[PDB]
């Protein structure tokens, strides 16, 4: 039988508590590692947190017209009135996202800061069958809804490099420059339980918000389809991970392409 | 009602602006800011591993609290006010529970980081200009409000204009400047009877170069009345020879009836 083995994984620190169970072996809640709902530093990163750096935009309405700095920054405002990516917004290539700031005239509910106003969707941490923990929807979630965000440490390349356990690893590479990651195995929210799905549900987006420091673009996971309730959240970790990776794809989706079965189909 | 909130949004609650004294629009000579910035490379120390924190799996309302036994004991009681027995005259650090902690966010540890909860109105006074008074009553130790401003160095504090807004922060010497940016405490008043006082506090970083300011009721503070704190005589030092106090105070010590009659009691002796 399934029983809760913690009431918030976050311990409050989300708009929602995000709740832990297992109906599957008798493996309990993990605790190999620290919750976090910001990402962290370990060692000086130099983010760029001078206010006066910061492109705003000045607005008097809800930031709505198409005259919205920030909007334009992004090519255009994607969030709809009630905070969802809108259709037309590109799925495959996605636009940097810059929110409104502390430097706006705008108002803190304006329309373009949705990221910043964190996790609005029920979630649960679950015991899958063949993938460990998942992230599963408690509640139907529409097409570009914001879910949660890729929290972990604020780490360089050098140091990605010099690390054992690469499975937590979101990559943060610019135009033409430096190299940055999160990682999410000593330090990391809700997102780092989220598994790979062949068919994704959620889609990673770039944002900046308090800091346009552009060597660190925040990771703002959106549904990219109608999410039922129970449906496990996933998104394409890119073939860079199972070129990588001793482990074949337990997605079982009809449309895998990383299964033992998908894989041995391209050797032949 | 002129403005409906000065926070434009930023705050738990609305703040307000109303004038029944004269003709004078509510300010927009500076910008709003929930939080303190900065317009320089500061490098506040945000090392995660650099944090002390506690391992309470309670709410941290025990002795056993390593951030409570940094701030000497936790001073705060179940509904988050300052202790009685706390030190109004020499106040101790405030080491609130942050990220680092085992405890839960709304652990008794977190007093200041979970911003204003008391109703404040910014308003125009009769001979002190802008001023904060209350909406509601605060009881004796209720947090009000963070000094918010620009986090500037002392040799940037000793190039600026207007020092009308700079809140020490010694410990090396940095400054919070509320003229350019700043929240609403950057229109409290001086009272020579105060009914406020500034704490340092540290949460998500501790970082001792930069405490953040707290404002702590010192006493009952009845609805309407006006909100302040003691400048310092080193503020009165300063501004003296352009300006006196108006806080109107029978026990005042900065009025121009103060100042004439301690230059006429040294006439009187030397
Ligand atoms: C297979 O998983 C990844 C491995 C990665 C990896 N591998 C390095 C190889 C060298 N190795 C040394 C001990 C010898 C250390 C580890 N390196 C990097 C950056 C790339 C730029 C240069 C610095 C390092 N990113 C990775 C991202 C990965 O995940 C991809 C995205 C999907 N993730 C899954 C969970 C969250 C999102
Ligand atoms: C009169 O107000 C103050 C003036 C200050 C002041 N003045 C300097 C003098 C030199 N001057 C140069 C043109 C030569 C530049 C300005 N300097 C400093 C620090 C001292 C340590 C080294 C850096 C500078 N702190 C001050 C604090 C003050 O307010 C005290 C608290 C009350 N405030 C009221 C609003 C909120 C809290
Ligand atoms: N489609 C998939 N097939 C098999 N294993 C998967 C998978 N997606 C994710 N995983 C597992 O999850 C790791 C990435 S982090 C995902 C959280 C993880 N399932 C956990 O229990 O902590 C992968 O390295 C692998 O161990
Ligand atoms: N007790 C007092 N007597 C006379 N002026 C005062 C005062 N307390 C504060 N002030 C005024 O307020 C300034 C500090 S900032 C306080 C906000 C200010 N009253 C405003 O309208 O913006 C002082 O330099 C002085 O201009
Ligand atoms: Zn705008
Ligand atoms: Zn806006
Ligand atoms: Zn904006
Ligand atoms: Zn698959
Ligand atoms: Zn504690
Ligand atoms: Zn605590
Ligand atoms: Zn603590
Ligand atoms: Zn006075």
Redesign the interface.
Known sequence: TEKIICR?VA???ENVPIPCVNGVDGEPCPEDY?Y???N?????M?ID????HLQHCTCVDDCSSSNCLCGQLSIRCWYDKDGRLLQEFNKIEPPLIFECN??CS????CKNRVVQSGIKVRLQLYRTAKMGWGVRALQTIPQGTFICEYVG?LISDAEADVREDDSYLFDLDNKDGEVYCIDARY?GNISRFINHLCDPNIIPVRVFMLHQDLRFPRIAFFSSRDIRTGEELGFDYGDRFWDIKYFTCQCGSEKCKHSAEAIALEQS
């Open positions: 918030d311990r409050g620190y620290k976090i709902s910001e962290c530093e370990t060692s000086t130099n947190r001078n206010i006066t502390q430097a705008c108002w803190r509910n440490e330090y």
